Amino acid sequence: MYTFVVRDENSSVYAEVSRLLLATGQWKRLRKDNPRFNLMLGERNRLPFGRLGHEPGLVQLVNYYRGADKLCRKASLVKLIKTSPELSESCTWFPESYVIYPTTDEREVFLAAYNRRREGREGNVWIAKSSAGAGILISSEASELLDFIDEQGQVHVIQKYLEKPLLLEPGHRKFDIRSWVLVDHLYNIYLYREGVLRTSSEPYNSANFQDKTCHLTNHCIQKEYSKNYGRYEEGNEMFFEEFNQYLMDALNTTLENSILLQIKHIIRSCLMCIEPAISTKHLHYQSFQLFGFDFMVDEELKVWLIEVNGAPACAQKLYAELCQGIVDVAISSVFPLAPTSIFIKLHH
Amino acid sequence: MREIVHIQAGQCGNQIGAKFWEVISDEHGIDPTGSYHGDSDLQLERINVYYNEATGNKYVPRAILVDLEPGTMDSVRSGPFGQIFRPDNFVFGQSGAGNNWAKGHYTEGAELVDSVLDVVRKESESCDCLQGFQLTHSLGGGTGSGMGTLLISKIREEYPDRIMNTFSVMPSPKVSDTVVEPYNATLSVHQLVENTDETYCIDNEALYDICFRTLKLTTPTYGDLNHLVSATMSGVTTCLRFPGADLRKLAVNMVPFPRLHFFMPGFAPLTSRQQYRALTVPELTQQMFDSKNMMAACDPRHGRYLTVAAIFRGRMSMKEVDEQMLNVQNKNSSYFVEWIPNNVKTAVCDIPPRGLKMSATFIGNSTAIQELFKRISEQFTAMFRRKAFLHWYTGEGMDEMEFTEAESNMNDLVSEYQQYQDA
Amino acid sequence: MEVIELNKCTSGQSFEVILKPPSRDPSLEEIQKKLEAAEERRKYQEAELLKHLAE
Amino acid sequence: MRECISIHVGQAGVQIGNACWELYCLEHGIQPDGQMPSDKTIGGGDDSFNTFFSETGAGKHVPRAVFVDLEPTVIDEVRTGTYRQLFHPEQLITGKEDAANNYARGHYTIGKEIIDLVLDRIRKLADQCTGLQGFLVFHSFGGGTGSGFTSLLMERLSVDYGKKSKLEFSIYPAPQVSTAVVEPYNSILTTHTTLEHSDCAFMVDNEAIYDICRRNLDIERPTYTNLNRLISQIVSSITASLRFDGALNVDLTEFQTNLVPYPRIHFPLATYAPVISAEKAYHEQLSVAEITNACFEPANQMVKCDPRHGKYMACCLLYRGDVVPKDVNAAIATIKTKRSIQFVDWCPTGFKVGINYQPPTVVPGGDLAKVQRAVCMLSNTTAIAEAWARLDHKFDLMYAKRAFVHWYVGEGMEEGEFSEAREDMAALEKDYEEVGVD
Ligand SMILES: CCNC(=O)N1CCc2cc3c(c(OC)c2[C@@H]1[C@H]1OCc2c1ccc(OC)c2OC)OCO3
Ligand SMILES: Nc1nc2c(ncn2[C@@H]2O[C@H](COP(=O)(O)OP(=O)(O)OP(=O)(O)O)[C@@H](O)[C@H]2O)c(=O)[nH]1
Ligand SMILES: Nc1ncnc2c1ncn2[C@@H]1O[C@H](COP(=O)(O)OP(=O)(O)CP(=O)(O)O)[C@@H](O)[C@H]1O
Ligand SMILES: Nc1nc2c(ncn2[C@@H]2O[C@H](COP(=O)(O)OP(=O)(O)O)[C@@H](O)[C@H]2O)c(=O)[nH]1
Ligand SMILES: [Ca+2]
Ligand SMILES: [Ca+2]
Ligand SMILES: [Ca+2]
Ligand SMILES: [Mg+2]
Ligand SMILES: [Mg+2]
Ligand SMILES: [Mg+2]
């Protein structure tokens, strides 16, 4: 019998994992404060890693990599890419970004590169993001961008906006590619076979950045500010099968060749970079974690990384399959119970 | 030397005490004449915990035998090891106590208690470093129950910084001598609540059920019941009698709240006379925690373990002992309160008891023990609501108020257990 | 990565390597007070016990 | 030359002391009878080993040590042990009734009766010192004597020897070899009362020593003897600089200077390598790079924790055996390019290195194999606060119910001291986080 605890009731992914574990009859759920557990589904904030692996006779496993926040925070992610030799400041798959502190700070470097673009006639549109979310500004002038950051009061990043995105037809609209990646206790990198494209239903309008219903593709912005929400695809969610068929009929290519090779390369690069800092190979407890990578594709079929989510959700149609995959490769691999794999192992 | 002074009072106390000294005298190699004839110096390592060394290298138990009638002690003096006891330590009257707590505590017992304290003081004075006292008695009678608890009160007054430990046999209607046992037991439990540090609760119905259901004894006798008790007493005193471990450190780790110091003892194996089959460490561990091996007739699954002490005896794998002990509490962690980390402690002893290659003794401080005090309380109230049989006690100077108070004290003890079974 | 303050002897040597530059105890009486205070609380508890046993 | 006096308190302190002084004798060529043929100066001398050993006119080298336990059973083993000749009766102090795993009993009830006697026996050793550096105090956190009496002695030592330095070797409690349920209480009570009186303290988690013995020595169920021999090797490599010629950590003051920039954060993490089983016939001798790389593996630390998720304030590398500076810097270079070694901003990123050419000595018949080179790393990293977090959590679980508190109040302690000690540990935990996290 295996025992586990649940410390994040807001997790939709691991609420299903808990249901699957109980449904096997060989796992028993305990109280959130009982220390005699094999598996912890820890909380998102201040997970007590220091108290794991000190229970005699218990192999303990947790569903988060201590230190992976460096990759899953927009500010620290930029710092990681700019300061890591593996991911040089000149890596071609990450947009030019700068960390701007409202009140170590790159506000001056951003202005310098802005003036280089302002001097020439090259596109000089930038976007400002932060950790609040749920606070985004797309402007052509640096003054307006830096002013909004000082008024918010949080660490932000100024990143070059993709003025030339790939547009799905019919619609002439932007989109986003979420990829789910699972890293097990052995630091194997598994890319979920199924991705999801979060598409905008409004036609991409380059003239007006004020109307962020076509520029921002977040599901929340579409289901509240989009008149054409759900017109082209159910819930503005296009899956790989359709997107692949589209790329063939329109651009005479496959999803694997034009995009998926860059995605796997990016995933491998980011995760291999931090492996020495977060690996639990010789550690007294073990970790695995599910990540959400967000990619943008431009009109030249070039993939760009925009964000990495450490506590991501899943697509409704894919919850069952993915969560079962988590139990198979991440949990049952350490705690065996009594091949058409849904994952692609990114070797390294 | 951390000497322990042993006291056995009344019929039950002296019969189980006699068996206890017969059992551990064999383990330490002492014969019925007090002469040592063992083969391992491990037998004499801490022999001074229970035995004094007399002239000629004789070993005399540090035991005081007390009773208000001579009958049971005469049979002890004529028993197997009756001669190893110092004759001066037989203190007895002639009137008896008539299964009457008042007679033991207030009248007949009061007249004799000073004589007993004289012997206790003589045994204590010749102790290099007295740990405390160990009392064997029943709670259903008059002498062990009433005079036993009077002795404990007088001993605490004269030795307030010493540990007081009792083996207390709880009455049961299934193994009953008189209808007044619930009265005597209820009056005693309050004395124990206030004046002992550790009390092993031995329920006579549990002992009966074990002799009948498990040992396949169609007609259990008191002798059969006492076989289980002596085997249990040997187990719970192993850590005191062999290198490893004193009464205060036991209390410190077993008693998180002063009043909740009533332990459920258990023993394994207990086999019907199949007695040659070897027992693996997993089997010992499962049986030791099994309700059928408990001596308090309480269902552990009806409460939670505040603390647990375990003792494994014999040549076995300590690695496998730790593994199985971790397995028990890792698989049933809901029955161990989470607000006392690592509340299960295990000891090992290479010397196995006579007749067994391996044995396991269990000491649990469980909140399920409240079921025992609740049984007594119900039986008490059923008679007290009609004042039945009270005249035996008012005739000795007691009044009804003292029974009402004993009743309330018992129900408070039950409530105190209930607050931690949910906390 | 500079080695500084190298000191050598017959038993061994020691040195320092820099990879990067940087960016009232209680008195004897006060202790006796605490010890004696704890003993008084200890004598008060025993006197109460003995008084309770006297009742 | 300046003398150091070692004090061993409680069972853990005493038994660890016996293992260390056994090892010291083997290292310095001192036979069990106290004779030292290599010492050509008879009856005196100011050599490095005289920091720990005085000398009689007959040529006996007597440890500058005091053993103190509230019960006699453990110290009586020293009186009859192999090195009984080494010590004289005045050095061994035993009580009658131990602290029953109760801090209050060791600190107040029982400690009050014996503290004056211990201090007087210490004064005797101090009176034969031309210049005393300070004291080395060995004790457990969890025991009643090791916790309660040690904190009392540390307070009085500060009064009588205000200028002298005090270092600790502390045994952190692990349930796999634990002896009491209330050890979290005693640990936090004694840390709170000893914090201001200790200049530098080396914590050793029995859990780590236990697993190192099972993993590297192939011991299924390690005993105290196994644990103490390994601990004494680590203590030996920490104190070698005081007992041999050298220029690094030559006096107790230098430990504080090199390892403790902020006084409250004075708990350096010790990491040791290699630990090789003596039952292994064939063994490939490890290199300078390999043993140095092993100093950054949590599996070799005296306290399990992850320094990758903290920050360093200082780092010392203490080598014993065939090691030359060239190999050390070569190994450090490559390790810095593969390890997460983050120093606080207000500290230089570097390593103080000490090399003693004499390889580690192993007790004949012990479990540790002879090796050509070994290293002990002393790094002051915030990651060691994980041990405080673990300990404070167990404390919070019990004290929220007041479990076992009556045992301490019954000995004269007030319930308020529980909360005061916990509040001090709370401030300690936040100091580490303020130093190591962004
Ligand atoms: C040196 C003693 N070592 C030791 O392992 N034990 C554990 C088992 C045990 C069993 C006994 C016994 C004991 O004491 C004489 C002990 C002692 C004692 O002391 C610590 C301790 C004890 C008991 C329970 C504990 O926790 C619930 C505990 O806490 C760690 O007498 C009656 O049967
Ligand atoms: N490493 C190691 N730990 C020990 C040793 N002896 C005891 N311990 C640990 O110390 C703690 C118990 O404290 P002790 O030193 O035994 O108790 P004490 O200091 O003698 O105080 P008392 O309560 O009076 O007996 C437990 O956590 C033990 O695991 C030892 O020899 N080596
Ligand atoms: N550098 C860039 N270039 C072009 N478009 C960008 C961009 N950064 C962000 N966007 C657009 O803005 C949207 C919001 O960006 P981002 O992914 O940072 O927010 P978010 O944290 O809400 C996504 P999630 O809900 O997955 O965490 C993206 O979906 C993308 O369409
Ligand atoms: N286990 C056991 N219980 C006994 C024995 N003798 C009496 N009892 C129980 O003890 C109670 C009677 O008390 P008893 O010791 O005979 O009275 P006392 O002499 O006045 O102390 C009843 O509950 C009996 O069941 C015995 O030998 N063994
Ligand atoms: Ca009379
Ligand atoms: Ca000399
Ligand atoms: Ca000082
Ligand atoms: Mg996000
Ligand atoms: Mg009778
Ligand atoms: Mg001790």
Query: Using CB atoms, which residue from D247, D333, D411 is nearest to C1?
Result: D333
Contact indicator for C12, D357 with CB cutoff of 8 Å: yes
Task: Give the Cα separation of B379 and B370 in Å (integer).
Answer: 14
- Strands, E assignment, B274-423: 305-314, 344-349, 358-366
Distance from CA of C26 to the nearest CA of B (A): 31
Contact indicator for C52, D375 with CB cutoff of 8 Å: no
Nearest residue of B to residue D143, measured between CA atoms: B249
Q: If we measure between CA atoms, which residue out of A146, A152, A160, A161 comes closest to residue A105?
A: A146
Query: Using CB atoms, which residue from A54, A56, A67 is nearest to D308?
Result: A67
In this structure, are B52 and B200 located in the same domain?
yes
> How close is the Cα of A313 to the center of ligand 8, in Å?
11
A313: left (phi over 0), alpha (psi -120 to 50) or beta: beta
Task: Give the Cα separation of B420 and B409 in Å (integer).
Answer: 17
**In angstroms, what is the C-alpha Rg of chain A?**
21
Contacts of A276 in chain D (CB under 8 A): 338-340
Is the shortest distance between the CB of B124 and ligand 4 below 6 Å? Answer: no
Q: If we measure between CA atoms, which residue out of D37, D418, D52 comes closest to residue D235?
A: D52
**In angstroms, what is the C-alpha Rg of chain B?**
20
Q: Which residues are within 8 A (CB) of A141 and not within 5 positions of it... i.e. 6 or more apart?
A: none
**Is residue A200 helix, strand or coil?**
coil
- Strands, E assignment, B40-175: 51-53, 59-61, 63-67, 90-92, 130-138, 163-170
Distance from CA of B319 to the nearest CA of D (A): 6
Q: Which two tokens stand for residue A164?
A: 């030339």
Task: Give the Cα separation of B243 and A236 in Å (integer).
Answer: 74
Between the CA of residue D427 and those of B375, D20, D393, what are the distances in Å?
Answer: 50, 34, 14
Count, residues in chain C: 55
Q: What is the largest CA-CA distance in chain D?
A: 63
D39: left (phi over 0), alpha (psi -120 to 50) or beta: beta
> How close is the Cα of B123 to the center of ligand 5, in Å?
26
Chain C touching partners, 3 or more CB pairs below 8 A: B, D
- Strands, E assignment, chain A: 2-6, 27-29, 39-41, 61-62, 97-100, 126-129, 137-139, 156-160, 175-183, 189-192, 196-199, 237-239, 286-287, 289-297, 303-309, 343-345
Q: Which residues are within 8 A (CB) of A217 and not within 5 positions of it... i.e. 6 or more apart?
A: A174, A175, A176, A198, A199, A200, A236
Q: C-alpha D188: how far from its chain's center?
A: 17
Judging by DSSP bridges, how do beta strands A137-139 and A126-129 pair with one another? antiparallel
Q: Which residues of A313-346 are buried (b: 16+ CB within 10 A; e: fewer)?
A: ebbeebbeebbebbbbbbbbbbbeeeeeebbeeb
C-alpha torsion D378→D380→D383→D385, nearest 10: 110
Task: Give the Cα separation of A311 and B244 in Å (integer).
Answer: 51
Which phi and psi angles does B36 have, rounded to 5°? -80, 135
Q: Could you tell me which residues of chain A have a Cβ less than 8 Å from any Cβ in chain B?
A: 1, 3, 30-31, 33-36, 56-58
Q: Give DSSP secondary structure letters for B211-248.
A: IIIIS--SS--HHHHHHHHHHHHHHHTHHHHS----HH
Is D82 within any annotated ligand binding site?
no
Is D206 within any annotated ligand binding site?
yes
Please calculate the CA angle A73-A76-A77 and round it to the nearest 5 degrees.
75
Q: Which two tokens stand for residue B404?
A: 């009402």
C-alpha torsion D241→D246→D252→D256, nearest 10: -100
Amino acid in position B175: V
Number of C-alpha atoms within 13 angstroms, CB side, residue B187? 33
Q: Cis before residue B269, ω within 30 degrees of 0?
A: yes
Task: Give the Cα separation of D401 and B343 in Å (integer).
Answer: 14
**Is residue A214 helix, strand or coil?**
coil
Cα distance from N-terminal residue to C-terminal residue, chain C:
81
Query: Across-strand partners of C15?
Result: D353
Catalytic residue among D3, D22, D183, D254: D254
Q: If we measure between CA atoms, which residue out of D169, D109, D180 comes closest to residue D142?
A: D180
Q: Cis before residue D274, ω within 30 degrees of 0?
A: yes
Distance from CA of D122 to the nearest CA of C (A): 17
Judging by DSSP bridges, how do beta strands A196-199 and A237-239 pair with one another? antiparallel
Contacts of B248 in chain D (CB under 8 A): 100
**Residue that the structure tokens 């390690």 belong to:** D222
Q: Which residues are within 8 A (CB) of D408 and not within 5 positions of it... i.e. 6 or more apart?
A: D102, D103, D104, D185, D418
Query: Across-strand partners of D312?
Result: D343, D381
| From-to residues of CATH 3.40.50.11480 in chain A | 2-68
Task: Give the Cα separation of A211 and A207 in Å (integer).
Answer: 10
> How close is the Cα of A7 to the center of ligand 8, in Å?
21
Amino acid in position D160: D
Q: If we measure between CA atoms, which residue out of B353, B411, B327 comes closest to residue B22?
A: B353
**Is residue D307 helix, strand or coil?**
helix
Task: Give the Cα separation of A58 and A30 in Å (integer).
Answer: 14
In this structure, are B41 and B61 located in the same domain?
yes
Is the shortest distance between the CB of D207 and ligand 2 below 6 Å? Answer: no
**Residue that the structure tokens 């100011």 belong to:** D46
Nearest residue of A to residue D342, measured between CA atoms: A277
Ligand that comes closest to the CA of residue A177 = 3
Q: If we measure between CA atoms, which residue out of A203, A195, A220 comes closest to residue A303?
A: A195
Domain covering A2-68 in this structure, CATH number:
3.40.50.11480
Residue of D357, D379, D420, D435 best to disrupt the C interface, most CBs of C under 10 A: D357
Task: Give the Cα separation of A97 and B153 in Å (integer).
Answer: 81
Q: C-alpha A93: how far from its chain's center?
A: 15
**Residue that the structure tokens 């490599």 belong to:** D237
Q: If we measure between CA atoms, which residue out of D233, D237, D271, D298 comes closest to residue D380?
A: D271
Distance from CA of B30 to the nearest CA of A (A): 41
Contacts of B341 in chain A (CB under 8 A): 35
Q: Which residues are within 8 A (CB) of A279 and not within 5 positions of it... i.e. 6 or more apart?
A: A187
Positions of chain breaks in chain C, given as the residue before each break (C to N > 2.5 Å): 23
Q: Could you tell me which residues of chain D have a Cβ less than 8 Å from any Cβ in chain A?
A: 175-176, 207, 297-299, 304-306, 308-309, 338-340, 385-386, 389-390, 393
Task: Give the Cα separation of A113 and A115 in Å (integer).
Answer: 5
Q: Which residues are within 8 A (CB) of D227 and not within 5 positions of it... i.e. 6 or more apart?
A: D177, D206, D209, D210, D213
Q: If we measure between CA atoms, which residue out of B178, B175, B220, B180 comes closest to residue B202?
A: B175
Q: Which residues are within 8 A (CB) of B389 and not within 5 positions of it... i.e. 6 or more apart?
A: B179, B180, B183, B383
Task: Give the Cα separation of B47 and B40 in Å (integer).
Answer: 12
Contacts of C25 in chain D (CB under 8 A): 155, 158-159, 162, 196-197
Between the CA of residue B90 and those of B17, B126, B197, what are the distances in Å?
Answer: 13, 18, 26
Contact indicator for A100, A149 with CB cutoff of 8 Å: yes
Chain A touching partners, 3 or more CB pairs below 8 A: B, D
**Is residue D21 helix, strand or coil?**
helix
D142 CB within 8 Å of a chain B CB: no
Q: A316-321 contacts: CB < 8 A, separation 24 or more?
A: A316/A235, A317/A239, A318/A180, A318/A192, A318/A194, A318/A196, A319/A12, A319/A13, A319/A16, A320/A16, A321/A194
Specified resolution (Å): 2.2
Is the shortest distance between the CB of D99 and ligand 2 below 6 Å? Answer: yes
Amino acid in position A70: K
Chain B touching partners, 3 or more CB pairs below 8 A: A, C, D
Cα distance from N-terminal residue to C-terminal residue, chain B:
40
| From-to residues of CATH 3.30.470.20 in chain A | 69-70+166-346
Element (H, E) at A205: none
Contact indicator for A197, A295 with CB cutoff of 8 Å: no
> How close is the Cα of D120 to the center of ligand 6, in Å?
26
Task: Give the Cα separation of D310 and D178 in Å (integer).
Answer: 28
Domain count, chain B: 3
Q: Where are the alpha helices (DSSP H) in D294-414?
A: 325-336, 385-399, 405-409
Task: Give the Cα separation of D413 and D416 in Å (integer).
Answer: 8
Is D349 within any annotated ligand binding site?
no
Q: What is the homologous superfamily of the domain A69-70+166-346 according to CATH?
A: ATP-grasp fold, B domain (3.30.470.20)
Q: Which two tokens stand for residue D216?
A: 């590297």
**Is residue A309 helix, strand or coil?**
strand
In this structure, are B318 and B346 located in the same domain?
yes
Between the CA of residue A96 and those of A126, A143, A158, what are the distances in Å?
Answer: 9, 18, 8
Task: Give the Cα separation of B261 and B255 in Å (integer).
Answer: 6
Positions of chain breaks in chain B, given as the residue before each break (C to N > 2.5 Å): 244, 273
Q: Where are the alpha helices (DSSP H) in D52-165?
A: 73-79, 103-104, 111-127, 144, 150-160
Ligand that comes closest to the CA of residue A130 = 3
Contacts of B326 in chain A (CB under 8 A): 56-58
Amino acid in position B311: I
A244, with CB counted inside 10 A (0-12, 13-18, 19+), is middle
Query: Across-strand partners of A168?
Result: A173
Q: C-alpha B204: how far from its chain's center?
A: 12
**Residue that the structure tokens 């007044």 belong to:** B180
Task: Give the Cα separation of D6 and D26 in Å (integer).
Answer: 18
Atom of ligand 4 at shortest distance to CA of B170?
23
Judging by DSSP bridges, how do beta strands B90-92 and B63-67 pair with one another? parallel
Task: Give the Cα separation of D322 and B133 in Å (integer).
Answer: 61
In this structure, are B84 and B218 located in the same domain?
yes
> How close is the Cα of D219 to the center of ligand 7, in Å?
41
Query: Across-strand partners of B202?
Result: B169
Q: Where are the alpha helices (DSSP H) in C1-55?
A: 28-54
Chains B, D: CB contacts under 8 A, how many?
61
Task: Give the Cα separation of C33 and C38 in Å (integer).
Answer: 9
Distance from CA of C49 to the nearest CA of B (A): 8
- Please confirm, yes or no, whether D254 is among the known catalytic residues: yes
Count, residues in chain A: 348
Q: C43-48 contacts: CB < 8 A, separation 24 or more?
A: C45/D410, C46/B160
Q: Which residues are within 8 A (CB) of B385 and not within 5 positions of it... i.e. 6 or more apart?
A: none
Amino acid in position D60: K
Q: Which residues are within 8 A (CB) of D108 and not within 5 positions of it... i.e. 6 or more apart?
A: C35, C38, C39, C42, D148, D411, D412, D413
Please calculate the CA angle B387-B391-B395 and round it to the nearest 5 degrees.
145
Of B353, B368, B383, which residue constitutes the final position of a domain? B368
Q: Could you tell me which residues of chain B have a Cβ less than 8 Å from any Cβ in chain C?
A: 153, 156-157, 160
Q: Which residues of A115-138 are buried (b: 16+ CB within 10 A; e: fewer)?
A: eeeeeeeeebebbbbbeeeeebbb
Contacts of B330 in chain A (CB under 8 A): 3, 36, 57-58
Contact indicator for D306, D382 with CB cutoff of 8 Å: no
Helices and strands, number each (H, E), in chain C: 1, 2
Q: Do B333 and A36 touch (CB under 8 A)?
A: yes
Task: Give the Cα separation of D49 and D61 in Å (integer).
Answer: 10
Q: Do B157 and C50 touch (CB under 8 A)?
A: yes
Between the CA of residue D71 and those of A311, C18, D13, D68, D95, what are the distances in Å?
Answer: 56, 50, 13, 9, 5
Q: Which of B7, B8, B12 to probe ligand 4 with, by most ligand atoms within 8 A of CB? A: B12
Task: Give the Cα separation of A22 and A12 in Å (integer).
Answer: 16
Task: Give the Cα separation of D244 and D331 in Å (integer).
Answer: 25
Q: Which of D177, D213, D221 to probe ligand 2 with, by most ligand atoms within 8 A of CB? A: D177
**Residue that the structure tokens 């249901």 belong to:** A19
C-alpha torsion A24→A25→A31→A34, nearest 10: -100
Judging by DSSP bridges, how do beta strands D349-356 and C12-20 pair with one another? antiparallel
Task: Give the Cα separation of A135 and A148 in Å (integer).
Answer: 9
Q: Which two tokens stand for residue A250?
A: 């329109």
Q: Give DSSP secondary structure letters for D176-210.
A: GG---TTHHHHHHHHHHHHGGG-SEEEEEEHHHHH
Between the CA of residue A161 and those of A89, A120, A215, what are the distances in Å?
Answer: 17, 17, 10
Q: If we measure between CA atoms, which residue out of B291, B310, B301 comes closest to residue B336?
A: B301
* Experimental technique of record: X-ray
Range of the domain at B378: 369-423
Sign of CA dihedral B350, B355, B357, B360: negative
Amino acid in position A121: R
Q: Which two tokens stand for residue A198?
A: 């979060």
Sign of CA dihedral B365, B368, B370, B372: negative
Task: Give the Cα separation of B90 and A334 in Å (integer).
Answer: 65
B408, with CB counted inside 10 A (0-12, 13-18, 19+), is exposed
Task: Give the Cα separation of A163 and A215 in Å (integer).
Answer: 10
Which residues have any ligand 3 atom within 6 Å of their CB?
A: A 95, 127, 129, 133, 159-162, 174, 176, 216-218, 294, 296, 306-307, 309
Residue of A51, A62, A272 best to disrupt the D interface, most CBs of D under 10 A: A51
Q: Cis before residue A170, ω within 30 degrees of 0?
A: yes
